[PDB]
Structure formats: C-alpha cells, structure tokens
Amino acid sequence: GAETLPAEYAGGQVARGARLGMLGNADVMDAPFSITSYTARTIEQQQARSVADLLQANDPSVRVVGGRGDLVDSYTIRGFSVQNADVAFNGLYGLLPFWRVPIEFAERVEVLKGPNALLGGISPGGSVGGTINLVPKRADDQPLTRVSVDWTQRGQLGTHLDIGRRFGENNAFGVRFNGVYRNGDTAVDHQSREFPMLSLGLDFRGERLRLSSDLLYQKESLEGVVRPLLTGPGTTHIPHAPDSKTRFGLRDSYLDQEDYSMVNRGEYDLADNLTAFASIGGRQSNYETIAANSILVGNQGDIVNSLARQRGDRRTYSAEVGLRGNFDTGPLRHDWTLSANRLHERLGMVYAFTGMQSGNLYQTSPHTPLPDFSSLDGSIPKTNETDLGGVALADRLSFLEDRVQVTLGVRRQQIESRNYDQTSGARTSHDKRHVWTPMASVLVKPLQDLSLYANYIQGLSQGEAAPMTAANAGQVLAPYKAEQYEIGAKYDLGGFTTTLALFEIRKPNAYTDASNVFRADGEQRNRGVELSLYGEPLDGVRVMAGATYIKPEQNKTGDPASEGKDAPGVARRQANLGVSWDTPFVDGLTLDSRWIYTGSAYVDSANALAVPHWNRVDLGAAYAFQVAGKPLVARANLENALGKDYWTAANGYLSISSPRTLSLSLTADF
Ligand SMILES: [K+]
Ligand SMILES: [K+]
Ligand SMILES: [K+]
Ligand SMILES: [K+]
Numbered sequence: 269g270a271e272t273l274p275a276e277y278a279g280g281q282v283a284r285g286a287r288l289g290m291l292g293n294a295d296v297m298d299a300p301f302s303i304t305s306y307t308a309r310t311i312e313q314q315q316a317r318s319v320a321d322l323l324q325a326n327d328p329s330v331r332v333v334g335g336r337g338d339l340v341d342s343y344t345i346r347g348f349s350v351q352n353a354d355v356a357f358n359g360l361y362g363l364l365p366f367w368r369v370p371i372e373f374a375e376r377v378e379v380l381k382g383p384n385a386l387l388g389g390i391s392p393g394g395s396v397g398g399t400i401n402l403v404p405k406r407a408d409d410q411p412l413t414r415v416s417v418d419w420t421q422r423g424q425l426g427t428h429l430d431i432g433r434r435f436g437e438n439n440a441f442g443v444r445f446n447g448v449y450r451n452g453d454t455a456v457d458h459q460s461r462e463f464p465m466l467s468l469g470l471d472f473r474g475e476r477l478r479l480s481s482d483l484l485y486q487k488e489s490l491e492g493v494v495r496p497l498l499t500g501p502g503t504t505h506i507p508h509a510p511d512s513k514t515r516f517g518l519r520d521s522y523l524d525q526e527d528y529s530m531v532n533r534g535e536y537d538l539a540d541n542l543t544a545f546a547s548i549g550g551r552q553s554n555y556e557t558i559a560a561n562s563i564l565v566g567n568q569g570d571i572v573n574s575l576a577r578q579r580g581d582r583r584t585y586s587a588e589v590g591l592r593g594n595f596d597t598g599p600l601r602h603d604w605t606l607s608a609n610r611l612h613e614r615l616g617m618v619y620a621f622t623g624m625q626s627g628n629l630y631q632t633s634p635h636t637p638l639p640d641f642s643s644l645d646g647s648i649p650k651t652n653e654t655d656l657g658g659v660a661l662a663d664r665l666s667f668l669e670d671r672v673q674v675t676l677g678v679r680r681q682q683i684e685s686r687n688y689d690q691t692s693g694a695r696t697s698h699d700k701r702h703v704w705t706p707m708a709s710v711l712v713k714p715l716q717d718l719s720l721y722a723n724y725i726q727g728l729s730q731g732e733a734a735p736m737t738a739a740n741a742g743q744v745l746a747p748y749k750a751e752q753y754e755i756g757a758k759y760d761l762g763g764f765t766t767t768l769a770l771f772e773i774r775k776p777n778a779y780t781d782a783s784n785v786f787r788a789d790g791e792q793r794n795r796g797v798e799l800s801l802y803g804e805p806l807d808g809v810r811v812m813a814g815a816t817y818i819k820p821e822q823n824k825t826g827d828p829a830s831e832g833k834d835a836p837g838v839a840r841r842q843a844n845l846g847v848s849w850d851t852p853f854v855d856g857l858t859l860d861s862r863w864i865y866t867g868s869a870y871v872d873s874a875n876a877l878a879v880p881h882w883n884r885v886d887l888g889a890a891y892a893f894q895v896a897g898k899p900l901v902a903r904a905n906l907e908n909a910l911g912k913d914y915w916t917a918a919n920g921y922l923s924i925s926s927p928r929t930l931s932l933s934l935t936a937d938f
C-alpha cells in the first residue's frame with residue numbers, strides 16, 4: 269500500500285524505501301530517484317537529537333549550515349539550499365518546527381535528492397535541492413515502556429520517555445507518546461539550552477479505513493545564540509576558524525522558539541482498485557530573539573556584531589485530498605494518482621536591526637548593551653499571508669511484468685502571497701502566479717537486484733523582490749523554474765547496495781545588473797555524480813559510505829568576475845564513511861566510527877574568498893545488558909573527536925563548527 273512503512277534494510281540502519289510525495293512509498297529498487305531513509309535505530313545509536321545531527325553525521329549529500337548553537341539549521345543538497353521550514357512530514361509541508369526539526373519522535377528521516385515539484389508541490393521556503401521527510405513513530409504490537417536518561421557536555425541533563433501500546437481486535441489501534449525534557453549548559457561558552465518536547469502518534473487500522481493523528485509540541489530556549497560570520501565589502505581573506513567553544517557573537521543573546529502542530533490523515537478503500545485519502549493539519553510557531561550576526565571587518569579576525577530583535581507569530585494550515593487506483597489496458601498496468609493540496613499561512617514577523625558592537629573571532633564576547641527594542645513590544649501585526657494550492661495527476665505505467673516502469677505526471681501549482689509593512693501596515697506586494705510542472709521517469713530492472721533509471725523533474729521557487737537599492741525596488745519577480753535530469757543505477761547484493769547517479773540541475777538566479785535593475789537573468793547549472801554503499805557486508809559489520817562530486821557553475825551572471833565560476837557555499841567534493849561493529853568478543857557491545865569530509869569552497873561569487881576543506885571524526889559505543897529481566901543500553905557518542913575547528917561556507921557567510929562534544933545515555937525498557 270501507498271502508506272505502508274518500508275521495512276528496514278539489512279543492518280537496520282537504513283530502510284528499503286521512502287516516500288515519493290503523492291506517489292506514496294516506494295522501494296529503493298522501484299524509485300527512479302536517489303532516496304535514503306535513516307531509521308530510529310540509527311537515531312538512537314548516535315544519540316542524534318535533530319535532523320541536522322543525523323544528516324551531517326551520515327549523509328554524503330547533505331551538509332548543515334548554522335548548527336546546534338544557532339537558532340536555525342539549513343541544509344545544502346546537490347548544491348542548493350534547503351530550508352528547515354521545507355522539511356516534510358509524511359510528505360506534507362508546513363507542519364514541523366520551523367527553524368529546527370527534532371527527531372526523538374521520528375521512526376524515519378528520509379532524503380529525496382533533487383527537486384520534486386511534481387511529487388509534492390512547491391515547498392513553502394522555495395527549496396529545490398531535495399526534500400527531507402520525517403515519518404512519525406507508531407505503536408508496535410509489542411508494548412513499549414522505554415525510559416532513557418542522558419548527559420551532554422557541559423551540563424545538559426535529559427530524559428526521554430517513549431511509550432507505545434496497540435489495542436483492540438488485531439491490534440487495530442495504536443498510541444505512541446514521546447516526551448523529552450533536556451536542560452543545561454552546552455559545549456559552547458556561556459551557552460545554555462532548555463528543550464521540552466511532547467509527541468503523540470495515534471492510528472487506527474481497519475478493513476477499508478485507515479486513520480492517524482500526529483501531534484507535536486516542542487520548544488527550544490537558548491541563552492546565548494551563535495550566529496553566522498558575514499563577509500564585508502572588502503574582506504580579502506577568511507581568517508582561520510576559532511576554537512569552536514569560543515562564542516564571538518552577542519553575549520546576552522537569547523532565543524525562545526515554540527512550535528506545535530497536529531495533522532489528521534486518512535484512507536478509505538472504496539473498491540479493490542480505488543482508494544480515497546485526505547489530510548488536514550496546522551502549526552503554530554512562536555519566535556522571540558535578540559541576537560547578532562558577526563561581520564568581518566579587516567582581515568585579522570576583528571568583527572562587528574550587528575544586533576537585532578525578531579519576533580514571529582506564524583500560523584499555518586496544510587491539507588491534501590485525492591484518489592489513487594489501478595487498472596489494466598492489456599499488458600500494461602496503470603497505477604494512477606490524482607491529488608490536490610493546499611498550504612495557507614498568516615505570519616507576523618517584526619524586526620529591528622540596531623547596534624554595531626566591535627568584537628573578535630578569537631574572543632568570547634563580554635556582556636554588551638542591549639539596545640532599546642521596545643518599539644516591537646505588543647501584539648505582532650500581520651506581515652505576510654500565503655496560499656499555495658495545486659492539483660496533480662500522475663500515472664505509473666508498468667510493463668513486462670513490472671520490469672519496465674514509466675512514470676508521468678503533471679501538476680498545476682498556484683502561488684499567492686501578500687505582504688504588509690511592519691510599521692505602517694501598508695500593502696507592499698501581492699504576488700499571484702501559476703505554473704504547470706511535469707515529471708517523466710523510466711526504470712528498468714535487468715536483474716532482480718539491479719535497477720537502472722532516468723528522470724526529469726522540476727523545482728519551483730517564488731520570485732524574489734527587488735532590494736530597496738534597485739531601480740525596481742519592491743517588484744516581485746516571476747517564479748524560478750528549476751529543471752533536473754538524472755540517470756543512475758542501484759545494485760542490491762542482498763546484504764549491501766551500491767548506487768550511482770549522475771545529475772544536472774539548472775536554475776535561474778537573480779542579481780542587480782550594471783544598470784541597477786534586479787533581473788532573474790542568472791543561470792546556475794549544477795552537474796554532479798553521487799556514489800553510495802550501504803548495508804551489512806559481513807556479519808555484525810554495518811557500513812554507510814558515499815561520495816559526491818559536483819561542478820556548481822554560475823554559467824550566466826553578466827559579470828566576468830563571476831561568470832562560469834563556482835556558486836558560493838558549494839564544495840565540489842564531499843564524503844562520508846560510517847562503520848558500526850558488533851564486537852564478536854564482547855556480548856552486546858557495538859562500536860561506531862564516522863568520518864565526514866567537506867572539500868574547499870568559496871563564500872563569494874567571484875571566488876576570491878576560499879575556505880578550506882575539513883574533516884570531522886565521530887566515535888560511538890553502545891553496550892546492551894540485562895538487569896532483573898529488563899534490557900538496558902548504555903551509550904556514548906563523541907562528536908568531532910579530534911576537536912577540529914572549521915568554517916562551513918554559505919553564500920556571503922560562514923558558520924562555525926560545534927566543538928568536541930560527548931553524549932552519554934542509559935536506556936531501559938520496562
Ligand atoms: K515514508
Ligand atoms: K556514513
Ligand atoms: K542558512
Ligand atoms: K518541492
């Protein structure tokens with residue numbers, strides 16, 4: 269079925285399938301895309317708390333910007349940015365915590381590489397690099413009464429309860445609750461963090477009727493907020509990264525960020541070859557912050573911290589309804605889906621940038637003045653209203669005993685947004701557009717264990733508004749249509765799988781031309797190769813490895829200083845290697861190592877500002893034992909074991925590494 273949880277692959281660290289938006293779940297070997305799905309077991313073994321913790325440690329395609337000391341994580345995938353706000357939830361946008369998705373309630377975290385507008389519609393944030401999808405935990409038949417306690421340097425103490433029960437005839441009903449409370453000093457100087465999280469996953473499985481409800485509350489409170497380093501007009505070189513414990517932004521920064529959501533989902537089998545489905549959900553997101561971005565001034569590490577207060581009240585609704593069925597026109601099977609989706613959001617987002625305070629990269633900042641930001645006090649006005657709605661039709665044509673599979677789709681995507689000035693309430697912009705966006709794929713299975721494939725699909729982003737500097741200040745540009753071609757090969761030898769893919773993604777870029785009109789006449793052309801190996805090649809020895817190579821060409825810019833140069837914040841080379849080993853010499857003892865590599869990259873489109881490659885090494889240990897009939901597992905995670913300090917490049921800015929960080933936990937099942 270479309271919604272059946274894909275089984276775990278050999279080794280239990282990844283799964284055998286993942287969601288393809290409106291098409292539902294597909295096995296890796298029947299997906300004409302590059303998909304990876306990480307399991308709860310991998311989450312729990314690595315003591316990963318966020319999407320970022322997980323993807324950075326394991327995935328060769330994903331690299332994190334911001335990091336855990338910052339209020340936000342973003343992701344780069346196939347040399348494009350992917351916003352945390354663009355992470356899906358069972359294939360739906362707008363329902364997960366806006367700045368940073370927690371994963372201690374997740375059964376899977378999945379990554380579909382490359383744009384996928386046909387499959388899911390436009391992402392709220394306009395991301396086209398790839399779609400990250402979280403699958404919520406459900407209650408298993410066996411009852412779960414799990415408690416764990418944890419410690420993370422320097423003094424964060426936590427507790428996590430995971431309780432599940434199924435009930436009724438044939439265990440038709442499921443209830444799974446997760447609660448976390450984690451609090452205390454982080455690894456970084458003068459920083460502390462509080463984190464409460466509550467989730468519930470509720471399901472009913474009947475004969476023809478399948479229902480679920482997911483609820484989530486979370487809050488992230490920071491005392492001390494790490495922020496990026498911006499390049500300044502005459503930066504000529506990027507200083508060497510400081511000790512990752514140093515905190516060189518605003519000493520008395522804070523964040524309070526709260527997200528909560530609910531989504532209800534259903535299917536009903538109207539006949540043996542016809543199923544209706546729908547989902548309705550929404551999200552409230554409350555944001556309060558004072559912090560500062562650090563700006564490079566000169567070239568020996570001096571900075572200026574540019575202070576801001578930001579307050580946000582964000583209210584999102586997200587829904588889908590559709591039909592899927594199947595028929596035969598002779599030797600050909602049709603598996604068709606007709607879907608319609610809607611995201612509606614009202615946001616108030618106010619800010620004021622006041623304060624410029626001198627600091628240094630190599631120094632943890634002292635207490636400094638907090639400007640008077642009381643002009644943002646009171647109720648937060650509406651600053652934006654957005655409505656994204658689409659209708660799609662797809663058909664997977666299966667031929668020759670399902671060994672050839674041709675998928676075609678088209679979607680009509682509507683976009684509408686209105687903006688209002690934060691001070692005056694004046695209507696500033698109103699964008700209303702539509703785009704038709706198709707896909708086509710083919711997959712052939714020469715062997716049971718070998719799949720070859722090609723796809724074409726697009727990605728959409730809402731057009732930018734012209735900066736106030738420009739001749740066309742305020743004017744909203746047309747949507748950016750990204751286009752992907754990909755081919756690849758997947759080979760499953762039973763215990764492990766190797767994949768290869770080649771892609772290209774072309775996308776318009778906007779810039780201010782030499783006559784001060786902001787135009788989307790730029791083109792980026794990202795072409796790359798991806799290689800992966802995963803599974804359990806020997807008994808008790810699990811491996812996840814991979815490497816990418818990408819040429820992220822700014823193939824059209826006008827400006828000769830940048831033309832045909834590399835897009836900033838996009839390393840050409842990346843790789844990961846992870847090994848998890850059950851020691852045959854001690855019962856219950858498993859040892860993990862990981863190596864993460866990121867090649868050199870640039871911060872600027874002229875490519876005068878390069879930042880070096882980097883390496884991180886992680887070490888883990890888990891020890892499973894019994895006490896009084898009950899299973900316990902003690903774990904250790906050592907992230908960045910070598911204590912390396914490194915910049916991650918982005919476009920016009922960089923984010924500092926986290927320090928060497930030890931986590932310990934004990935888990936008990938009752
Ligand atoms: K899934
Ligand atoms: K890995
Ligand atoms: K970012
Ligand atoms: K998308």
Ligand SMILES: [K+]
Nearest residue numbers: 391392393394
């Ligand atoms: K959008």
Ligand SMILES: [K+]
Nearest residue numbers: 353392393394
């Ligand atoms: K957004």
Ligand SMILES: [K+]
Nearest residue numbers: 416418428933
């Ligand atoms: K824990």
Ligand SMILES: [K+]
Nearest residue numbers: 651652687688
């Ligand atoms: K706005």
Ligand SMILES: [K+]
Nearest residue numbers: 834838840869
């Ligand atoms: K590069």
